[PDB]
Motif scaffolding. Structure first.
Motif, PDB file in Angstrom:
ATOM      1  N   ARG A   1      84.634 -40.426 -11.371  1.00 27.97           N
ATOM      2  CA  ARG A   1      85.615 -39.791 -12.240  1.00 27.97           C
ATOM      3  C   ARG A   1      87.028 -40.187 -11.849  1.00 27.97           C
ATOM      4  NH1 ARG A   1      85.030 -37.480 -16.628  1.00 27.97           N
ATOM      5  NH2 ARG A   1      83.550 -35.902 -15.874  1.00 27.97           N
TER       6      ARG A   1
ATOM      7  N   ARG B   1      90.143 -42.208 -13.781  1.00 28.75           N
ATOM      8  CA  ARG B   1      91.439 -41.578 -14.027  1.00 28.75           C
ATOM      9  C   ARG B   1      92.579 -42.473 -13.572  1.00 28.75           C
ATOM     10  NH1 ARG B   1      92.229 -36.461 -14.851  1.00 28.75           N
ATOM     11  NH2 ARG B   1      90.325 -35.916 -13.702  1.00 28.75           N
TER      12      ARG B   1
ATOM     13  N   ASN C   1      95.605 -44.216 -15.785  1.00 34.01           N
ATOM     14  CA  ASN C   1      96.999 -43.825 -15.640  1.00 34.01           C
ATOM     15  C   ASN C   1      97.851 -45.002 -15.200  1.00 34.01           C
ATOM     16  OD1 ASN C   1      99.369 -42.261 -15.442  1.00 34.01           O
ATOM     17  ND2 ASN C   1      98.223 -40.485 -14.737  1.00 34.01           N
TER      18      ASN C   1
ATOM     19  N   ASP D   1      92.668 -35.481  -5.170  1.00 29.39           N
ATOM     20  CA  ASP D   1      92.669 -35.618  -6.620  1.00 29.39           C
ATOM     21  C   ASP D   1      93.834 -34.859  -7.227  1.00 29.39           C
ATOM     22  OD1 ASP D   1      92.097 -36.070  -9.221  1.00 29.39           O
ATOM     23  OD2 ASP D   1      90.196 -34.992  -9.262  1.00 29.39           O
TER      24      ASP D   1
ATOM     25  N   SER E   1      97.023 -36.684  -9.324  1.00 27.04           N
ATOM     26  CA  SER E   1      97.323 -36.274 -10.687  1.00 27.04           C
ATOM     27  C   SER E   1      98.751 -35.762 -10.798  1.00 27.04           C
ATOM     28  CB  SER E   1      96.343 -35.208 -11.141  1.00 27.04           C
ATOM     29  OG  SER E   1      96.724 -34.708 -12.405  1.00 27.04           O
TER      30      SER E   1
ATOM     31  N   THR F   1      99.872 -34.461 -18.285  1.00 26.47           N
ATOM     32  CA  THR F   1      98.450 -34.246 -18.478  1.00 26.47           C
ATOM     33  C   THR F   1      97.996 -33.037 -17.680  1.00 26.47           C
ATOM     34  OG1 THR F   1      97.446 -35.407 -16.632  1.00 26.47           O
ATOM     35  CG2 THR F   1      98.433 -36.727 -18.359  1.00 26.47           C
TER      36      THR F   1
END
Lengths: 147, 147, 147, 147
Positions: free
Chosen positions: A52, A56, A60, C54, C58, C73
Motif C-alpha cells: 500500500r 502511495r 505522490n 506512514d 503522508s 489528502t
C-alpha cells in the motif's frame, strides 16, 4: 514375585509421569501452532501495508513531478506486481483519454479504487487522480467519450 | 498369572494410545515445520519489497532535488548494501560521462535495470534516468563516447 | 528368572534415558515458546513503527503540496485505519475552523498528539501543524472560536 | 513363560522404535530452534534497515523544504527513538551554532556519523549536512567557535 509386583506398580506410576509429560508436549506444541498461525496472519498484514505505502509514495511523487512538465513513471498495483505487460504504460493524459473501456476497468481494479458501472464520466478523472495527473493543465483538459 | 495376562493386554492398549499420540506429535510438528518454511519465504519477500521501495524513494527525491541545482545523494542497491566503496560515488552528470564501461555495467547491475550488450548508446541515458538526473540541462547535455 | 531380573533392570535404565529425553523435549519447547513470544512482541513493535512512518510521510507530503494551492489528502491514524468515515474528510483550513469541539478532540486523538483540556486556543493550530497546513496563508489566517 | 519371553523381546524392539522416533523429535526440534534463531537475526536486520531508511527520508525531505525558507522538522535517531527530550529540538542553523560541545557529540552519535575528537571545525558543518541544512545561505553562513 512380590518385588515383581511392586516393580510393576512403580512402572505404572512411571507410565503416568511419561503420559503427563507427553500431554505437556501435546498442548505446548498446540500453542506453538496457534502462535505461528497468528504470526503468519500478522506478516500477511504487514505485506499488504508495505505494498500500500509503496503505491502511495509512487503516486505522490509523480504528483510533484507533474508540475514541471516532466513525464510520469509506472505505478505498482495494490498487490505489488507490475501491471499486465500487455497493458499500455502510462505517460500523460491523452494516453488515458484514448484508452479502451475494459482497460479502464482493469486499471481501476489495479489501483483498488471503486467506481460505478454506469457512470463512465468519472472513470477518467478518478484514474488521473489515482496516478497523480494533477497539474493545472491536467484540470483544464477535457476527457473524450468512448467509442 | 491371569491378572498378569490381562494386565499385559492393557499395557498393549496403553501402548496404542501412546503410539497414536506420538503420531500426533509427528504430524503436528511436520505442519509447524512447513508453516515456518512458508513464513521464511514470506519474510524474504517482504525484505525484497522494502529494499525496492527504498531505492525508489531515494531516486525520486534526488529527482526533485535536481531541479534546484542541488547535488544528488548516493543510492542503495536493489539488495540493500551500499555500492562497492571502490566504485566512485555519483554527484552530477559529467561524473557518469567520464566513467569506464565495465563500471557502467556494474552500476546497471546494481540498479536491477537490464541493458543491451551491444548498444552502448543508451547505457548513460538509462543510468541517468535510474538515479534521477532529470533536469532540463540533464536532457540537453550530450553524453561522450567511450575510449 | 535371573534374566528376568537383569532384563527388568535394563528396562529401568532404558526408562531413565526415555525420561531425560522427554525432559529435553520439555525444556526445548519451553525455550521455543518463549522465543515465539518475544518474536511476536518484536513484530508488534515493527507494525507500530511502519504505521508511524506512514503517517509521517503522508503529512510531510501534504506539506509541500500546500505550497502550490493544491488540495491536501486524507491521513491515516496512528494505528493505521482510515478515520471514522462519519468524521468529515479534511481539505483546507476553514474546514477545520468550522469543526465541532468533540470532533477536534477525536482528531487530536487520531494523530496521537497530546493537548490540554482547557486551552482550546491551541487545538486548531496544533491540528493544522499535525496534518500539514503550513503555507504562509496558513499562518496568516485566524481561527474562529467555538459555539 | 515362552510367550512371556518372546513378548518381552517384541517389547524391546518396540522400545527401539520409540527411541528412534524420540531422536526424530530431538533433532527436528533442534533444527527448528536454529531456524528460529536465524529468523530472529534476520528480523533484527530488517528493523535496523527500516529505521535507517526512515532517517534518510526525513533528512532528504528537510533538504528540499529548506529551499523555501521553511522550518525543518525533528529527525529520528539511527535506532528509532526520538532524541533525548532534554536535548533541544533543531529549527535552523544558528540553533546549532549556539550549541554546547558535549551536545554536539551527543547529536553526532545520534546520527551514526563519525567525527574526529580534535577537529571541532568540522562538527557543525557535518551535523548540518546530516540533518539537511543545505541551502545557499546554509553554505554562506559561518559557524562560530565554542566557548
Amino acid at each position: 514375585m512380590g518385588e515383581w509386583k511392586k516393580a510393576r506398580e512403580e512402572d505404572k506410576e512411571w507410565r503416568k509421569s511419561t503420559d503427563e509429560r507427553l500431554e505437556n508436549l501435546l498442548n505446548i506444541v498446540r500453542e506453538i501452532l496457534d502462535v505461528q498461525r497468528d504470526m503468519r496472519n500478522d506478516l500477511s498484514n504487514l505485506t499488504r501495508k508495505v505494498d500500500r505505502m509503496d503505491m502511495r509514495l509512487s503516486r505522490n511523487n509523480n504528483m510533484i513531478m507533474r508540475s514541471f512538465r516532466q513525464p510520469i513513471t509506472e505505478v505498482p498495483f495494490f498487490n505489488g506486481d507490475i501491471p499486465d505487460p500487455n497493458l499500455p504504460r502510462i505517460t500523460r493524459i491523452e494516453d488515458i483519454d484514448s484508452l479502451s473501456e475494459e482497460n479502464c476497468t482493469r486499471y481501476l481494479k489495479g489501483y483498488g479504487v471503486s467506481y460505478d458501472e454506469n457512470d463512465q464520466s468519472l472513470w477518467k478523472r478518478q484514474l488521473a487522480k489515482a496516478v497523480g495527473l494533477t497539474a493545472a493543465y491536467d484540470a483544464s483538459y477535457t476527457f473524450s467519450p468512448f467509442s
